[model samples]
Target: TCCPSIVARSNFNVCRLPGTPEALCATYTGCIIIPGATCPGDYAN
Candidate 1:
């Protein structure tokens, strides 16, 4: 119930959830933890 697209187009490195997914957005409601792909410095869900 996250990832609301409304801007011109945000871009960032993201990790795959229990499944697979991008973008280092969101903190709790929705967060990405990319390790071998695009892992940023930020603790999230």
Candidate 2:
């Protein structure tokens, strides 16, 4: 669920499966998206 290819592994690219959303927020300590990808708010460096 990290990369597009990861999801492409299967015929479906079902992101945010189950608790993935919250898990992502918790794991990254924040989140990343169109407005946050270049300028993240996590500890990714």
Candidate 3:
């Protein structure tokens, strides 16, 4: 995928894909995009 990769974590409000080793998921293998309508919280999926 051209976009970044992310782990499924509820803690991260915004997850930057292709995440670093420190941001990797130890029990998952997928990504997700959040939904909102404002800055720092305006993503929809």
Candidate 4:
């Protein structure tokens, strides 16, 4: 599953799924979390 919010982290973008250990962000390559990087689902500016 994915998060409800996607936020920006400096140079890259990330998921803003609060309360989790890390955030999951998506990219053209793949999905990553925390130290890592979803779109089209509950987007956040």
- Model 2: per-residue Cα lDDT at residue 41: 36
lDDT score, candidate 1, position 17? 48
Top lDDT model: 2
Q: How accurate is candidate 2 locally (lDDT)?
A: 0.35
What's the lDDT for residue 9 in model 2?
Answer: 23
Q: Where is model 1 more than 4 Å wrong at Cα?
A: 1-27, 39-45
Better of 1 and 2 by TM-score: 2
Can you write out model 2's per-residue Cα lDDT over 1-45, one digit (the tens) per residue? 222332232322233444555445433433234433453333233
> CA lDDT of each candidate?
0.34, 0.35, 0.31, 0.33
- Model 1 per-residue lDDT tens digits across residues 7-44: 21132223334333334334432544434544334332
Looking at model 2, which ten-residue stretch has the lowest summed lDDT? 1-10
TM-score of each: 0.18, 0.20, 0.15, 0.15
Model 4 global lDDT (CA atoms, 0 to 1): 0.33
Clashing pairs in 4: 25-37, 26-37
Candidate 4: residue 43 lDDT (0-100): 38
Please provide, for model 4 over 1-45, each residue's C-alpha lDDT reduced to its tens digit, 9 standing for 90 to 100: 233323333213323343333323345213344332333334322
Candidate 4 TM-score to native = 0.15
Q: Evaluate model 2: give its TM-score.
A: 0.20
